[PDB]
Paper text:
Rotation is driven by a flagellar motor, which is a supercomplex containing multiple rings. The C-ring (C = cytoplasmic), which contains multiple copies of protein subunits called FliG, FliM and FliN, switches the rotation of the flagellum between counterclockwise (CCW) and clockwise (CW). The switch is also the site of torque generation for the flagellum, through an electrostatic interaction with a stator called MotA/B4. The switch also connects to the MS-ring (MS = membrane–supramembrane), which transmits both the direction and the speed of rotation to the flagellar rod.
To inform on this pose, we determined the 4.6 Å resolution structure of switch particles containing the extreme CW-biased FliGΔPAA mutation. Symmetry expansion followed by local refinement gave superior results to particle subtraction. The CW pose contains significant domain rearrangement, particularly in FliG. Here FliFC–FliGD1 and FliGD2 of the inner ring and FliGD5 of the outer ring each rotate by ~180°. FliGD3–FliMmid undergoes smaller positional changes, rotating approximately 25° as a unit with a slight adjustment in the binding interface. Comparison of the CCW and CW poses suggests a mechanism for switching in the switchΔPAA mutant. Loss of the PAA motif shortens the FliGL3 linker and adjusts the position between FliGD3 and FliGD4. It also moves FliGD2 to eliminate a domain swap. Finally, the PAA motif in FliGD3 normally interacts with the first helix of FliMmid, which is held under tension in the CCW pose. Removing this interaction allows FliM to rotate.
Residue numbers in the entry:
A (entry chain M): 44 to 324
B (entry chain G): 3 to 168, 172 to 324
C (entry chain F): 514 to 560
D (entry chain N): 53 to 137
E (entry chain P): 55 to 137
F (entry chain Q): 57 to 137
Amino acid sequence: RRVVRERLQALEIINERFARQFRMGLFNLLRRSPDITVGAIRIQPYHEFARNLPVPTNLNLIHLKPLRGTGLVVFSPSLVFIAVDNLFGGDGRFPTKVEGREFTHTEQRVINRMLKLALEGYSDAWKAINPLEVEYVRSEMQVKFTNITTSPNDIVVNTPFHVEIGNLTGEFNICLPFSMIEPLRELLVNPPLENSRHEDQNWRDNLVRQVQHSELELVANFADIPLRLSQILKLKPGDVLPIEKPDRIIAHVDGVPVLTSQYGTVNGQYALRVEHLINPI
Amino acid sequence: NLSGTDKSVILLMTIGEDRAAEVFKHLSTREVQALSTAMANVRQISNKQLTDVLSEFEQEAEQFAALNINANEYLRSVLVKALGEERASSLLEDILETRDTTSGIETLNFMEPQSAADLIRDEHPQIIATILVHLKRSQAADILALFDERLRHDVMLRIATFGGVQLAELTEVLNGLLDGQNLKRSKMGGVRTAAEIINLMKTQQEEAVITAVREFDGELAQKIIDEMFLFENLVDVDDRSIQRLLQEVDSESLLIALKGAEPPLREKFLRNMSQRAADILRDDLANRGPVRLSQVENEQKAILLIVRRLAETGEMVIG
Amino acid sequence: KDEQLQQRRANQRLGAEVMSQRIREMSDNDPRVVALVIRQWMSNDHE
Amino acid sequence: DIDLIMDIPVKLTVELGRTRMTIKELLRLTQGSVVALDGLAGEPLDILINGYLIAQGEVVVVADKYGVRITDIITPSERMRRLSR
Amino acid sequence: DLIMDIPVKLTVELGRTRMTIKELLRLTQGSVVALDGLAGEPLDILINGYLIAQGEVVVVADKYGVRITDIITPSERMRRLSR
Amino acid sequence: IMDIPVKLTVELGRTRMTIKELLRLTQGSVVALDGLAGEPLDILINGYLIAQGEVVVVADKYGVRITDIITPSERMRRLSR
């Protein structure tokens, strides 16, 4: 049994701007403008993501301090082949497919350049909103060896991307554990907010100035006696129910108490004599 | 006589410890290790030898009138004040890499083609195509020849597609492949050293080994037997080499070897000789009686050792 | 005989060490005449 | 079905009065401040459970012990009239 | 029944465990604690803290729905309170 | 300071209606609550709340994945609900 649901707003924009940054980075790196198509953000268990992962492919570990845990990135063999031949200027119209064969030293080095470029791009994109350092840990071949999540059923978030350069195409993914963003679960849901300048706080203070003009309905309580509905049914008008001594009156609005008070007889009216505001701090 | 290495080694001791360390930094670690072993194993200079190495170094110094400093820093500093440090460091790195990549190109041309091909077999076909283009056309062909048909065809197809002529990354590619050679070593892995041991072993023992490896892998056994092939038939070794053996080996030993040889072997070893020599050899073979096979095998082994020595000298090919 | 050979060895060593000091001083005052002769040394070694 | 439910504990609540009041007023309020309520002195207090209207009653001091004496059971029509305010 | 239309508060629980405060003291904010009831047993269903019946949750219509199975059964209620 | 065992309590959701809606529903009738799939669960002691935390199952035995002590801020709102 493992269930999680949520809706996200900010990381979509974050992925879009990071994708634009990565596109321009690859353009300047390979002297050719690429195109990146960000897929819909995927929320799935770790085992489902591993099953959907096309083996063989290279997986890389990038830690995210100070949050405990390591991030994961993947790149397709088609993408690495196309990138490396473009680095050599090859047209790519006579491609080759390698399966099971581990990446050579040179191929791993080219993967290292893609890894560092992507790390820098995501670092700047993420720090544009929240400063969270990204540091590569260890590349991996098989997903089972990555074993990032505690359980295969652990639900993780993955961001797919479709990257092409002219006729040449490709797809790579960025998948993250949900526990990685569990402390920031409320922040990622919230859409990005601009300003935050000094006039933004007094703007909040302006809202407060509006807030003082508010309407509040208090509730006064005397007795909260536990009884039985059988007794209620046998209760008849004229019946009397004893009540303990109400040494004080609790005042609450929609439930939340604010103060304690003492009842009193004032100008022929049921009046209360407040003692002090309830401060939970 | 003193070898060129020993003279250089003695000069390396004489030039001083700091200069020797600087030369070690300027030179290859294999050279550093060789010099260290030489100065540890035994000194290379005697009083006549020290005189000779010092005198020849002096004649080198007379001719090498440097009137100049190495200035790996001083030359740059004079350049930096006039134009600025920046517009020199990158261009200098590019020039050095061009010297370095050409050095690697020449090294790959010199080193064995199939070894280069297998070192690059795992690498990218674009890498293979660009390195083939950069290499000498004899060397490029030699790396291409070994490759399987599909990889080779893709390589020639991508030769045309290579229009990017990329430039710093190519040098770094050469650097990456360069760092893998010092770990490769090998030598022990190759079959021919193992095959030579099989020849060295006792007849029945390598016959049993041949049967066992035929059970293990018929193709491997056939390859090792093809490596075995040494004057077991006329076509592989050729009549000229058959003539060469008979004029270089004792007639009595040749006849004793031919006692246990096949009649086609006798025919091939008698065609080259003239009528008189062939008649003498045939009469001697007919007259000589049976001999214990140990001596025949020993003389055959000596004859095959002579054949191997001739092949090593490289007068003619065998196979 | 043996004493004469020993004295010859001693004076040869003295001459060798002073002339080696001559190499030391010329190499100190001019490194260019050193690198090219090192190149010649390695050429002789590999040849 | 009915017999099953009868022996079940339930809670009840009673309210004194209601006044419009804003956070300015409550912040201005201090220790010992007196606040009245729309409930007239001597008016029977409304009786509810879990915020649901039940009846009305008044407190009577019987044997120097406080006790609320109910007076009526709210009809559906009068409950609708009360909520339609 | 003139008070039929009265909303009520229900309570559904998993299981109990006799747990001394020394245990919670070493229990961190991210610790794991077990219970007494075995997995798969229907959860007990109560209202306003009063025992009613038992049921089990099922993933139906994308919402946790509990399937009522037993009745108050006052004899069984007495047996349960007699523990 | 001195130690003593104490009764805990975990609550799976709360709703508001009359029992007759479920009293009419005989045994085997499935009924949902405000409790959905994914949200954490709270822990009560003697009926007094402590902390928020999910519950998992291990070795065919339930295990609470407690998260943090409930502060009065959210305590008040859950009391109001």
